[PDB]
Assembly symmetry: C2
Homo-oligomer: 113 residues x 2
């Protein structure tokens, strides 16, 4: 259940990789881990290629993530949002806060490589 | 009917927008297209929602683009009179956390610094 997380920096770009399902039981541990890893004027990539589903509570984690990156003057890219997930974020209107692509490769060009 | 009654005005620097109805799939475009433009630059806007019963996904999405866009113009916004039932809905998601709200017009004008 818990989300297996991996966190690193390569050239001032923080890469948080997530594996699992943003449950409502599993959401808190990921939030606890991700928010402290945002950098001011910071560039982050959140790789969601192996996240299978978000419920309301997992989407709240992204928005949470987005609001403090927004306020930290930082830049965040989502990598590999599942079709299903995007379609669910498009309905609510949350999708339009975010920058997103399908590859780690394109994601680094967006932030400066 | 499904049409929302939307008044817009400016009191001493503040753009005040008043809504009557619910914001669903049918009623939302008109509210967004009407309200969204009056978002000026470095502005002040009270959105009075005292008389809105509810708002579907599409509706709250309207509050969303108003927030996003209110940002593009780096301006202010206070939501007045949001019901508990609508307020719970925006807490489910955490959208609620994007906004500044109060129950009275006075407090808004105050949060915006008026008389």
């Amino acid at each position: 259940n818990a989300t297996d997380t991996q966190i690193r920096t390569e050239q001032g770009i923080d890469i948080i990789t997530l594996h699992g399902h943003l449950d409502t039981r599993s959401s808190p541990a990921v939030q606890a881990a991700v928010l402290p890893r945002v950098t001011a004027k910071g560039k982050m990539i959140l790789d969601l290629r192996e996240v299978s589903y978000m419920s309301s509570a997992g989407l709240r984690v992204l928005l949470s993530l987005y609001r403090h990156t927004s306020n930290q003057q930082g830049a965040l890219v989502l990598v590999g949002v599942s079709e299903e997930i995007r379609d669910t974020m498009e309905i609510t209107g949350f999708w339009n806060f975010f920058t997103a692509c399908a590859s780690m490769d394109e994601a680094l060009r967006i932030l400066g490589s």
